[PDB]
Structure formats: structure tokens, C-alpha cells
Amino acid sequence: HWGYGKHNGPEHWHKDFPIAKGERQSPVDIDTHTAKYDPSLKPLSVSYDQATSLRILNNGHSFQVEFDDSQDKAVLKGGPLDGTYRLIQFHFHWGSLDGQGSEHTVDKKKYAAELHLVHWNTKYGDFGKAVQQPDGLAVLGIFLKVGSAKPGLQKVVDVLDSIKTKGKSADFTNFDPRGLLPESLDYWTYPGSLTTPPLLECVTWIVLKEPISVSSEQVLKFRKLNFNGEGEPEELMVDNWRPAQPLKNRQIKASFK
Ligand SMILES: CC(=O)/N=c1\sc(S(N)(=O)=O)nn1C
Ligand SMILES: [Zn+2]
């Protein structure tokens, strides 16, 4: 099975998922001096006031918080998007050390972690259909840097002990994802892919310029999770990030000058 270890990590994925060597793979390095300002780009519209969180799960590759996406409760619109995209879950990627952990890089700089807010395009009716379309998903990427604690993240950090191993889940209601956003919504955007298998090239990536800061104690907690299931030999959940992929025939656009 695929993973992030030496024998089943990102450089092995292409044997089971040949699109790994595809034309619009993610993540990528964002070169700030060659990104193109596009003033036709609209401001992002984030409407999370009615979000309904349900559950948090250790999926063996990360942990994810799931939302009710049965109606237009929490949606993303605007930006480079046409149409409305519903939030279905968020998850993180992080490192073993503070100098690594993000998937995207900015002028080759890595961040300590990267938050992904995953949304799907409601014109396709459900998530499984949306991933088969080039404009099926929109993922909001937010960088984490180590510094001062983020209050809005503590409720997440506090329940990780209850989902330590693969396949564990816990009730996680009334979580407000607005507490995870930076102050500014300026962004870069490019067409790309899911960054874990099946690596489908169905994503409009929206990567926020401004990182959020978390404390060392907060990220430490991330690092105490386990890839393994209960009763199995312990393998700490760290470095669950894919390296930057070739940009190839793509342009990164910026919403800001
Ligand atoms: C949200 C979901 O069900 N899946 C995902 S989201 C994703 S990511 N990391 O956001 O590009 N990769 N995969 C496989
Ligand atoms: Zn992700």
C-alpha cells in the first residue's frame, strides 16, 4: 500500500498511479518573481458562517475534519472559480522538523505545515463525480509557520489523543473553520492535482500568501499521531508531504501586485 516511508513513498507512487508523472501534478514551487499578476482575478468569497463539522478521523495518512456537505452551508466562490464549491473536509500535512512539512513551497522556502480546505463543485452533484472533472475541486492551501499559538486551532489539537491510530474517529461538532484563516485573503492560483493517490488532476489550487502562525507545542501534538493502527508497531505520523512537481505547461497567477 502507498505511504510516505522509504519503501512506499512518493517516488514509488507512479507504479500504481501512473498519473503521478502527469502534466498537471501538485504540489509545485511558487516562484514569486515569475508568477503573473492577473487583475481580472476576483476576490475570494468564503462563506463559512453556517458550516457544520461532524467528525475528526485519523485516516492513516493524515487526520481530517469532516463537514456536512449535503447542502450549501459552507461554500467557496469568487477567485478564479466559476460556480459554487462546498467544503467537505480539511486536513494537514506536516514535518518531523519545523523547517519542513508544507507541500507547496514559496521561492523554495518550506513551511512547518500546510492546511488543505477541500471543496467540490456542486454542479457535479457529489464528490465522487467532481474528482473526475478538470474543474471538480478547489483546495484552499494555507501555510503554517512556528511562532505564536493559534487559538482557533487548539480544539483540534486537544482531541488528537483520542484518534492516535489509523481508523480512529471522534465526534467533532460545532468547530468553526473561520478561526483558521489569515487576515488577508490574497492568493496564488494554478490548475493542479490531488497530492496523494489517486492524484487526479481535478484541482484548482488556491494558495494563500499569508501564513498563519501556530506554536511549537501545537505542531508537536501533530507529530504524536501514528500512521499505524492500534496494536501495531508504532510509526509516528510525520513528513506526510509530497515533494514539489515540475510546473510544465502551467502559469501561476497572483491576485495581488
Ligand atoms: C478530500 C479527499 O477526499 N481527498 C484528497 S484531498 C487531497 S489534497 N491533499 O488536498 O490534494 N488528496 N486527496 C486524495
Ligand atoms: Zn492535502
Swiss-Prot record:
Keywords: Acetylation, Cell membrane, Cytoplasm, Disease variant, Lyase, Membrane, Metal-binding, Osteopetrosis, Phosphoprotein, Zinc. Activated by X-ray, histamine, L-adrenaline, L- and D-phenylalanine, L- and D-histidine, L-His-OMe and beta-Ala-His (carnosine). Changing residue 139 to G: Weakly impaired activity. It is an enzyme of class 4 (lyase). The modification Phosphoserine is found at residues 162, 169. Belongs to the alpha-carbonic anhydrase family. This is Carbonic anhydrase 2.
